[PDB]
Amino acid sequence: YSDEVLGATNWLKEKSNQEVFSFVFKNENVQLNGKDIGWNSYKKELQEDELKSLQRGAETTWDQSEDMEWETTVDEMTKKQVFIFDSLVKKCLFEVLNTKNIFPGDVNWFVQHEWGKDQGWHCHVLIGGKDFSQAQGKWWRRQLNVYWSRWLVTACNVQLTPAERIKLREIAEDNEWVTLLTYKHKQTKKDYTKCVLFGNMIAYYFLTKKKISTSPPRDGGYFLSSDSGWKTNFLKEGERHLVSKLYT
Ligand SMILES: [Mg+2]
């Protein structure tokens, strides 16, 4: 096996039992005063240095994980928007880490963009580490949703009035466009943050998904993944399944 596959397997296995939060970053369709704001209406490339660097990282992750044996026919607009969202999601995570004075190297994280049968594009984030505890989950979801809604309104490519921008900002927050995994519960009852096990969830679940290679995307497929160790980023689908196999 390649050093890359062996390296990824070992990195995940070392973290098999690390407790982490599970978030999903998403968006929902919005119509404001006749103006349609769809899942891919956020294609401004903002000239902030860190954001640009992050988007370049997403592009190269896509490029290196592309299997060229076969052909890929994913829409250009779709790829572009996913690259932009990868940069925005990570910007949000890093902004909250800054708030907590958490050194990025003390954090384990994993990001995976997917296409759901019903909801379409969304992005799973697993994140945790020594500076993280379960009771902080609700706060993390709220802070992340603040930055996510803020960045989405800045990246929106639909011409909006100030009133419409504010409406969009409050929709993204009120409707929780960042979700946090909790234990199952009744509506009026308490919800408890449900941490997951980092390495196991990646190897036994996220790495089992099928690669999106077409437009429209295959339901339940993944676009792009990355992690805090740059371990899974460049893996082709076949290599990801090998990682799962070796991990067991
Ligand atoms: Mg999913």
UniProtKB/Swiss-Prot annotation:
The active site is at 205 (for nuclease activity). In the N-terminus, the endonuclease region is involved in binding to the origin of replication. In the middle, there are the ATPase and helicase activities. The C-terminus probably contains a transactivation domain. A motif (RCR-2) lies at residues 122-124. Residues 1-248 are annotated as: DNA-binding. The gene is NS1. A motif (RCR-3) lies at residues 205-209. Homooligomer; when bound to DNA. Interacts with human SYNCRIP. Interacts with host transcription factor SP1; this interaction allows high levels of viral P38 promoter transactivation by NS1. A divalent metal cation binds at residues 114, 122, 124. Multifunctional protein which displays endonuclease and helicase activities required for initiating and directing viral DNA replication. Also plays a role in viral packaging and transactivation of several promoters. Binds site-specifically to 2-3 approximate tandem copies of the tetranucleotide 5'TGGT3' within the origins of replication (Ori), unwinds this hairpin region and nicks one DNA strand thereby initiating the rolling circle replication (RCR). Cooperatively binds Ori with host PIF and probably other host factors, which activate the nickase function of NS1. It is found in: Host nucleus. Residues 186-190 are annotated as: Ori-binding. The chain holds residues 6 to 253 of 672 of the full protein. This is Initiator protein NS1. Residues 16-248 form the PV NS1-Nuc domain. Belongs to the parvoviruses initiator protein NS1 family.
